[model samples]
Target chain A: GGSVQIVYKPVDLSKVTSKCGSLGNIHHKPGGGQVEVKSEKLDFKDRVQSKIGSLDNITHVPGGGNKKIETHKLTF
Target chain B: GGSVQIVYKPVDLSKVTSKCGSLGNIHHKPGGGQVEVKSEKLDFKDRVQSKIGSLDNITHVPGGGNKKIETHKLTF
Candidate 1:
């Protein structure tokens, strides 16, 4: 099965919605592990096209550590 | 042993904090079943006296579901 990864850490509610072009609410359970990307507003695979935002991708790593991850395209 | 019931669904960030009198953040993990209420600034038993807020109770429902809960009350 596929998994969703958080390329960003501790993003403010404004940045997650407006800058990232998220249509619906992003569920950020403070202590919880996964970020639920809504299917209604946008696709998880949509490339972030904004200059202000960061780019990310889902990599299906192999082995026991084999997991899907969202990583920043920028190296900052 | 008390459980906090969410009388409201998808409350806005500002309303939950100021109007509803929540001292700390209320955690709602998207797929997870439970909401973890923080215990730092306010006691879980504090009442909601606001008009916009809804009234709810921790019934202490018995039998197969005997459990404790947190609810609201008015000042005397």
Candidate 2:
């Protein structure tokens, strides 16, 4: 399934929202890779967007990394 | 132990770091309280600071909430 890459990085919140025409990772690997992660069946995707700003479709978010994530759709 | 309150909410990154003044929760309660959390010794304090920007005893982070958290100093 197609997924959107997301990351939790330093962003200029002032600009993230002010940009006129834009929008906007996860996972782990050896070497503590900075690979971006995404989601298909989880709200993890939007959570990052919520904190930073509007990631409409042509922009960025927290982008990605190897660090452990906070959540997924997984639940009881 | 002394704890700092934190909440994960919308932030204006442009101001969070640029504000030249000073800076600076944890826990939960019923009704999904929004009590902020803080750490005195653990680096959890800095982790949030790392993402948005400088929180040098003068600002905020993905602050706090009744929702579950990402991690803590706890380990085996």
Candidate 3:
């Protein structure tokens, strides 16, 4: 019916690696249908990678297309 | 008071399958509660499964129902 939405939150870098450990695959779909996103630790070498994590398990289907995206800088 | 939050991130192919692979069940309830969503890897053989994973441990209690849904298409 619609596209997936992504909301990024501002997170504490210091607390993340130490508390949550290296990022792993992260997925969140509350409506229905099974789709998930994956998150991994990005080395300092990569700046873009350092900021946001990747997404996985998406459903486009044949007719389903065009989804919304939300991004945030996590803080803690 | 509120519903659980699910965040999704994209992952790399090699690094994931080799290092920390596959879709995993993730739960994010910063405020409180212990609700989680389940995820599994989707094989090429199964396109539906290939794209995304599933969710589990959802709590839609009475009197306190309905919540916001977030979805994303991740790439790494």
Docking class of 3: incorrect
Candidate 2: chain B TM-score equals 0.12
Query: Ten consecutive residues with minimal summed lDDT in candidate 3 chain B?
Result: B12-21
lDDT of each: 0.23, 0.24, 0.28
TM-score of chain B of 1: 0.15
lDDT of 1 by residue, A1-76 (tens): 2332323232222111111111133334323232222222321222332211112222221211112222223221
Candidate 2 Cα errors over 4 Å, as ranges = A1-33, A44-76, B1-19, B22-76
Off by over 4 Å in 1: A1-29, A36-76, B1-20, B23-76
- Give DockQ per model, in order: 0.02, 0.04, 0.03
Q: What TM-score quantifies how close candidate 3 is to the native fold?
A: 0.12
Give the top-scoring candidate (lDDT). Answer: 3
Worst 10 residues of 1 chain A by lDDT: A14-23
In the predicted model 1, the residue pairs found to clash are: B2-B68, B2-B69, B3-B68, B3-B69
lDDT of 3 by residue, A1-76 (tens): 3444445433322211111212354444334333333534212232222111213232211221222233433332
iRMSD, all candidates: 33.5, 32.3, 29.1
Whichever of 1 and 3 has more lDDT, that candidate is 3
